[PDB]
Scaffold this active site. Structure first.
Site, short mmCIF file in Angstrom:
data_model
loop_
_atom_site.label_atom_id
_atom_site.label_comp_id
_atom_site.label_asym_id
_atom_site.label_seq_id
_atom_site.Cartn_x
_atom_site.Cartn_y
_atom_site.Cartn_z
N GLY C 51 0.82 -1.19 0.00
CA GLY C 51 0.00 0.00 0.00
C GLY C 51 0.86 1.25 0.00
O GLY C 51 2.00 1.23 -0.46
N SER C 80 5.24 -5.91 -1.26
CA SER C 80 5.60 -4.51 -1.40
C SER C 80 5.87 -3.95 -0.05
O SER C 80 6.77 -4.35 0.59
CB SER C 80 4.55 -3.72 -2.23
OG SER C 80 4.95 -2.49 -2.79
N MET C 81 5.13 -2.96 0.30
CA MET C 81 5.23 -2.37 1.64
C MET C 81 5.15 -3.43 2.72
O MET C 81 5.83 -3.33 3.75
CB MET C 81 4.13 -1.32 1.84
CG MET C 81 4.44 0.13 1.41
SD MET C 81 6.02 1.01 1.72
CE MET C 81 6.78 0.17 3.10
N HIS C 105 8.89 -5.47 -5.25
CA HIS C 105 8.84 -4.89 -6.58
C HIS C 105 8.99 -3.38 -6.45
O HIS C 105 8.83 -2.82 -5.36
CB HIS C 105 7.56 -5.32 -7.32
CG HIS C 105 6.32 -4.58 -6.92
ND1 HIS C 105 5.11 -4.81 -7.53
CD2 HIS C 105 6.09 -3.63 -5.98
CE1 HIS C 105 4.19 -4.03 -7.00
NE2 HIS C 105 4.76 -3.30 -6.06
N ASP C 149 7.91 -7.83 -10.46
CA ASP C 149 7.44 -8.58 -9.29
C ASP C 149 8.36 -9.77 -9.00
O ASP C 149 8.60 -10.61 -9.86
CB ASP C 149 6.01 -9.07 -9.52
CG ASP C 149 4.97 -7.98 -9.33
OD1 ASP C 149 5.34 -6.84 -8.99
OD2 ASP C 149 3.77 -8.27 -9.51
C1 LIG Z 1 3.78 11.79 -5.97
O1 LIG Z 1 4.72 11.11 -5.18
C2 LIG Z 1 4.28 9.86 -4.72
C3 LIG Z 1 4.44 8.75 -5.53
C4 LIG Z 1 4.01 7.51 -5.10
C5 LIG Z 1 3.43 7.34 -3.85
C6 LIG Z 1 2.95 5.93 -3.49
O2 LIG Z 1 2.07 5.79 -2.70
N1 LIG Z 1 3.50 4.74 -4.13
C7 LIG Z 1 2.94 3.44 -3.79
C8 LIG Z 1 1.93 3.25 -4.92
C9 LIG Z 1 0.52 2.78 -4.58
C10 LIG Z 1 0.47 1.80 -3.42
C11 LIG Z 1 -0.46 3.94 -4.42
C12 LIG Z 1 3.90 2.26 -3.90
O3 LIG Z 1 4.83 2.31 -4.64
N2 LIG Z 1 3.67 1.05 -3.12
C13 LIG Z 1 4.52 -0.13 -3.19
C14 LIG Z 1 5.66 -0.05 -2.18
C15 LIG Z 1 7.09 -0.37 -2.63
C16 LIG Z 1 7.58 -1.81 -2.49
C17 LIG Z 1 7.56 0.32 -3.89
B1 LIG Z 1 3.65 -1.39 -2.83
O4 LIG Z 1 2.56 -1.65 -4.07
O5 LIG Z 1 2.78 -1.09 -1.44
C18 LIG Z 1 3.24 8.46 -3.03
CL1 LIG Z 1 2.48 8.34 -1.41
C19 LIG Z 1 3.68 9.71 -3.48
#
Ligand SMILES: COc1ccc(C(=O)N[C@@H](CC(C)C)C(=O)N[C@@H](CC(C)C)B(O)O)c(Cl)c1
Ligand SMILES: *[B]([O])([O])[C]([C][C]([C])[C])[N]C(=O)[C]([C][C]([C])[C])[N]C(=O)C1=[C][C]=C(O[C])[C]=C1Cl
Ligand SMILES: *[B]([O])([O])[C]([C][C]([C])[C])[N]C(=O)[C]([C][C]([C])[C])[N]C(=O)C1=[C][C]=C(O[C])[C]=C1Cl
Ligand SMILES: *[B]([O])([O])[C]([C][C]([C])[C])[N]C(=O)[C]([C][C]([C])[C])[N]C(=O)C1=[C][C]=C(O[C])[C]=C1Cl
Ligand SMILES: *[B]([O])([O])[C]([C][C]([C])[C])[N]C(=O)[C]([C][C]([C])[C])[N]C(=O)C1=[C][C]=C(O[C])[C]=C1Cl
Ligand SMILES: *[B]([O])([O])[C]([C][C]([C])[C])[N]C(=O)[C]([C][C]([C])[C])[N]C(=O)C1=[C][C]=C(O[C])[C]=C1Cl
Ligand SMILES: *[B]([O])([O])[C]([C][C]([C])[C])[N]C(=O)[C]([C][C]([C])[C])[N]C(=O)C1=[C][C]=C(O[C])[C]=C1Cl
Ligand SMILES: *[B]([O])([O])[C]([C][C]([C])[C])[N]C(=O)[C]([C][C]([C])[C])[N]C(=O)C1=[C][C]=C(O[C])[C]=C1Cl
Ligand SMILES: *[B]([O])([O])[C]([C][C]([C])[C])[N]C(=O)[C]([C][C]([C])[C])[N]C(=O)C1=[C][C]=C(O[C])[C]=C1Cl
Ligand SMILES: *[B]([O])([O])[C]([C][C]([C])[C])[N]C(=O)[C]([C][C]([C])[C])[N]C(=O)C1=[C][C]=C(O[C])[C]=C1Cl
Lengths: 174, 181, 172, 175, 177, 180, 174, 172, 178, 174
Positions: C51, C80-81, C105, C149
């Site tokens: 997330g 991911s997270m 990923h 992934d």
């Molecule tokens: C505009 O700047 C940004 C750019 C991206 C985010 C963001 O949330 N990225 C998230 C994307 C989605 C879950 C919404 C994200 O990359 N999550 C992944 C985490 C890791 C392993 C890379 B895994 O799908 O939870 C945010 Cl706040 C702010």
């Protein structure tokens, strides 16, 4: 023959509304026609567009620069965005806008982070290329372009002439 | 469409075939029909195919591709506006020496995208792998370069100006006006 | 209730989408376990598919901030997270159940999109670097192994350094 | 004259996209006009179909083997499911596929009280058993092999379909 | 109904319910219960009552591993149906203590699913890994050879309590106490 | 969904007040309430206002802001995850010397935002400009900076790491654990 | 709450349709009453149009599994699976209020042909099983149940008592 | 020759419904065609419009004033907002309403703070421009057009005659 | 959703009434209930009404207004954030001498907004108009301002700062810290 | 020729269904072209309409009188609100209804306080305008018309005749 079918017989082509793949290639087909029926009489492109698909507008752009007849552009209503871009791209000395027209220029708009970077560098290249081509159409420093497309840049026809985006303002036939 | 004959049809009488927008079985077969029509009309002269497309279905594009080549007529290709994915595939699929792009057109290439049981998913994913590999190979043949370049370069979206594509082998010449010949 | 009870046994759960509310709920629990006792281990139970990044970072910085050693346990999945927070547990005290799956990923005007794409790449590298720290691995290995992934068994996530040991039964 | 009427002057018929009641009966009507115009020159059925409604396609099937002019099919793009079926039933020795075509054969997909369900399922299994029969006839294959090779989506290239007996020859250029 | 609610009262009998699709919500709720009962007493059996169509594989594995981890043997009882993940967790109970009620049905099938080719490949290969792992585990539970599970699950395989008890999926079919 | 011991009520007398997600009249006023509560119980103990918000309404944010400056406690702010826009306006509003952040938080600041007759749109734009200038000046006071720095740095989305927000003057320190 | 009070007197309701959750709530009440007193009868009040066959067999096999006799009472209506659960109360102890409405029909619903085959075969197994069990409840022949469930069969409490479904219709407390 | 074509034949052009980019361009093309047929015979423009886009209306406006033929205007039913702009733009001496046609004039009415500031400046400019052009069509001050178009200003045909909005109202 | 120690009851223990959001029937009546209960609980102490509202229905607001004037306790208003439209009317209705605003709170006043047969429409428009003029009545009263001043200053949105609201007569003082 | 063009050759113009701007203006166009075709022949306006845009109705109305030919109106089926108004507008001496038609007349129905004041005042002005034109078509006291338009007033063709809306009801060609 419908009203546009006839006005196409005085070598008048129109661009109305947004610049889509279909509207753009329709303009392109009309231009190719008017050249194949006479590559030495000038073609008159009347533009009333807010902009649209950059790729679609470039189909037109490159066709105008490609065909032998001179393409005289006249802005009625508005030439904003790629509309302003195709208006500025007319044959030099042959670019025009009705007295109460309005021209608007601005920088462009709108998967994995890798693909984010790909499309981001590409969109910045589009910003660069468009700034350069517009500095060309206007004989201005690229810097002038970058600085004048950062946000919304609206122009009376006076301002677009002085800015070099068009050649003359036409109240009427005289 | 304004009537002059209507405009796309009048240009049809210059052997001008258009593909505008994305690739659907619909428009793919419309274009296939025009190409077969221009061969039944003149199986010798050159057919002029204009591309402004983002890509689309793979078998839809393969139908066009196979209409090309098979017909005796040479199908020159010219990209305007954009020719991405299957559009770029077709642009590179034109008669060698007769693939072109206007100066400010844009060409993009990428690996094949997607819009049940583990058995069915296994089957269809491996089908997509064979498809991706066949596409990479055909494109390596159109760009007259090796394959490895095509696999590496189509892993993610690979955009190119009118000049990078020519140096790649997608097209053969850029044209500013007819004088550019 | 059941979760308040398990909490009284110092067990915190992360289930499903890491969001603002869920992450900060975990955060409140963490600070309360440090409040009640700042010197007994906490046991963080994770079945999340990932997330929000800043949501998960609130959690990360808390786990590293509070005095209690926060142990981690993956059950079902940590993605991911989720996989990131599983990697983030106190070293030697990170676990997963014998059939868990760990998966890592990568994550207006053109001025704005430039700002945000540069931001996103900053985030991507930040995550690769912290992750490499956790697993004690090379940023160049994280880059390659998170490009698409990457699915991993407990044995694989162990050799990769994501986790210390696999818990079959409570014979460590 | 529009483009498709002109191409009918070449005795060329298309099935583009899904097989529906209409999109199949239109094809049947074209196969009929080509037999009225001239009942001896062959019709050439061009096929780019994902498959679909089996009754709609059975109309085309029975029509192909009904009319007097030989009917020569050609797979372009794809002959999947009932596509692959009608392509398989073209006048023998006149079933062709473009070199980069694709063909797929499968058992039928699909998607009241228990007596209804009991009626409809036993209709569908009878269908499933008819289709493998007529395919084994079209491919000069065994019926058991069609039964097996239709259990799940069987994908085949133009040469693989030619080796199955689904098509006769592949065509590269005018030659 | 408040008796605490009904399910907490039966939890004071070490009765844990799995009803409906195995979501992440429900799987973690069951897991929290399992842990609570081992905390209350790690030596009295726990009684896991399964009526589920199945659901998320990883959700269900959060349960499947908690069972083999907690000290209590976890006796399983199918009432109604235990399908897909339901049947799997049902056969996952402590051997000798897996039960079904005589009109329970049990169904085993192979796994299901609802971007780029490189990603589609990774996830299809992953699903194949899932299928094979689950097949080996089911073979262990039912004390069968792996090929038999591969064969008997390729499509939907329904099963009466007699069929199930023979398939080693459960130990007894309990008419009554 | 909040476990009882509820957990934020418990924390409320560690004098910890949370702000999470958007800043809205409702959530901003809930924080406004918690602040007065903690002051009444002890108007001589510091409050620990923790912020993980992407921002929101500006009047909603000014509720929390002007309350922060009115009660007798020091309102020590902290950022975890993200304090963006008004969330970042409030993090810089904490008592000077007591504004902090965790290692991998993310601040971002930028100018105002928005999703009738010409005469009316005239007025609404005028007020939005008054507010852009107001935010800029107050912001400029918070980081002990020149107002021009803030106009320059907030024209678009300015993202900051904790080091960068510190140097900027938004926060005073970066906290990795208890020895910090 | 009123229903916990009534649970104290060993009355378990079943209102509305019989889902996994409602059926499990009834099963849980069954087990709670049994554990609380295994030797006293349990009163099961059914106003239900039927529902999930599997959620129904949970209640069925559970009624059969607990020691207490489960008397069933139909108020309002017991339809399809509701009626089946009504006829399953302990023999001699199945009742209905006078203006009840009973209904019974065969099963119904509201993939690949091989899968479809498997599924239809299973549906027919369910149909036959339910007819056998229902017939045992009623002390009728199986063919009786086959014919009489072919479509929706409606019964007054009267007619439900002749058919073998309940035992006594209950006017007043007398 | 459909009804509207037949009526075009003798220099009758209809703007019916709102002023969009397309409905305006049709009238523009008709004006150009009728001039290409004869720049010296007048063009009668029949207007029943609530108004519409401002760009699309100035296209017809400048097309009206550019071409050689006098453009006479005729309001039927209503000419509101932009429709009343072009009705006033008719060649002076040649502007007409029907007896029970109704006129209305009003001032115009429809990102970050920067972009809002920009578009607001642009709309205030548009308003000014229109008020000046309207001051001159009518013989009236710019003050009269600022005050009177502040809100929706409704006009009988006769009041519009008074205002310099049209020249004559026509019975039979 | 709301922390116990819930917090709003607990600040009610301090004679703090909130109006947060748009003035609806249920929220305005939830305010009327609290004013009555605090008058009953102690009619010799001030109640502290804290307004952060864009405004809303005029009858819903009139209930609060008339209730502010009915009861015995001085109702002391405080703007925090924004008191727009009706919210501003309430804030200005506070006991003269006890109306305040936090310094970055923004105030707004405007004329009444609104969003059948001709007879019915004339009828309702008459009731919108006496409403506009009655609101101007009361606001010119609260401001010690003449009526024409208000009629003029409300034809469109009039945004005000704390200091400007003070100069108008809408509040009495601004509060920074106690 | 479509059927409507054929009947338009006989100088017949239909008003069918609602009175929108597009429909009313099409009828305006047909009136004008029939005049062009022959200004010494009368025009047959066939009204089966429930009413519509008062402004569009006025667009047709102001035409009727202005062109030279008498515009006869005939109500078949019904003529309500604006349709009835245009029916009463037919050349005095040439306002017809069919036997089973009927007529309906009523009053006109459907921001900031200033703008609503404005639009209100305007709507009441439209009301007065329409009432006075009505009293003129039907020569009745204006008191009648407003008092007879407070709500929906239905009239047979006979009632319309005695009211002054129409002039003659027509059985057959005799
Ligand atoms: C505009 O700047 C940004 C750019 C991206 C985010 C963001 O949330 N990225 C998230 C994307 C989605 C879950 C919404 C994200 O990359 N999550 C992944 C985490 C890791 C392993 C890379 B895994 O799908 O939870 C945010 Cl706040 C702010
Ligand atoms: B104009 O408003 O048409 C403007 C053209 C300028 C640069 C002269 N248009 C754009 O920049 C458009 C925005 C919409 C008007 C379509 N942007 C794009 O077309 C677009 C869309 C998607 C992607 O992905 C790379 C790029 C672009 Cl450039
Ligand atoms: B491109 O966007 O034109 C791309 C094709 C390139 C590589 C020549 N398009 C696709 O690959 C499409 C994706 C959608 C955008 C339509 N993919 C498919 O059509 C597809 C779908 C399914 C399967 O196997 C099940 C294969 C393919 Cl190739
Ligand atoms: B294929 O996708 O064309 C397939 C037919 C093949 C085997 C030749 N299509 C079908 O089988 C369709 C499925 C949908 C995709 C339309 N099935 C039916 O039309 C169908 C429906 C119902 C019944 O009996 C009730 C039989 C059949 Cl055959
Ligand atoms: B059963 O239908 O619940 C079945 C369980 C056993 C018998 C295999 N469940 C699944 O197969 C589920 C699918 C359901 C959502 C219908 N499979 C997954 O959830 C799944 C699928 C694929 C992947 O890799 C991408 C992960 C998971 Cl967790
Ligand atoms: B940030 O995106 O939270 C930003 C705060 C910064 C500028 C300090 N918030 C806004 O700019 C919001 C965005 C909307 C979602 C509401 N804007 C306002 O709060 C706002 C803007 C303008 C006006 O009156 C003109 C009122 C308000 Cl409340
Ligand atoms: B009654 O109308 O509730 C009826 C019960 C018997 C007496 C006929 N209900 C059902 O048969 C239900 C249908 C709906 C009312 C939900 N049937 C099932 O739930 C069902 C159907 C099919 C299968 O096989 C896949 C299982 C189940 Cl559980
Ligand atoms: B009338 O309602 O047609 C009115 C014309 C006059 C009398 C003022 N129309 C407008 O004012 C229009 C508004 C709507 C019809 C959409 N104004 C514009 O179209 C407009 C407004 C502002 C800008 O700059 C962003 C462009 C445009 Cl095109
Ligand atoms: B403000 O937007 O709260 C405004 C009040 C003052 C500043 C004039 N409220 C209203 O104008 C509301 C409109 C809705 C947004 C609630 N108007 C009324 O509530 C109202 C309007 C008119 C009438 O009589 C017809 C009664 C009421 Cl209650
Ligand atoms: B009838 O229902 O057609 C009726 C006509 C007579 C007999 C009164 N129509 C109207 O009154 C119409 C209402 C609807 C048909 C929409 N009135 C208007 O159209 C109208 C009303 C008010 C204003 O000024 C704002 C303009 C218009 Cl166009």
């Amino acid at each position: 023959f419908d009203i546009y079918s006839r006005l196409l017989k005085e070598r008048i082509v129109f661009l109305v509304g947004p610049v889509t793949d279909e509207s753009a290639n329709l303009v392109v087909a009309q231009l190719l026609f008017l050249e194949s029926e006479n590559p030495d009489k000038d073609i008159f492109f009347y533009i009333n567009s807010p902009g649209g698909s950059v790729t679609a507008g470039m189909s037109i752009y490159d066709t105008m620069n490609f065909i032998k007849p001179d393409v005289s552009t006249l802005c009625l209503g508005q030439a904003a965005s790629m509309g302003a871009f195709l208006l500025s791209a007319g044959e030099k000395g042959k670019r025009f806008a009705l007295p109460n027209s309005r021209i608007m220029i601005h920088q462009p708009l709108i998967g994995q982070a890798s693909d984010i970077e790909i499309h981001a560098r590409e969109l910045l290249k589009i910003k660069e290329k468009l700034n350069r081509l517009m500095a060309k159409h206007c004989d201005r420093d690229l810097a002038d372009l970058e600085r004048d497309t950062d946000r919304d840049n609206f122009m009376s026809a006076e301002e677009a002439k002085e800015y070099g985006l068009i050649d003359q303002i036409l109240e009427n036939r005289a």
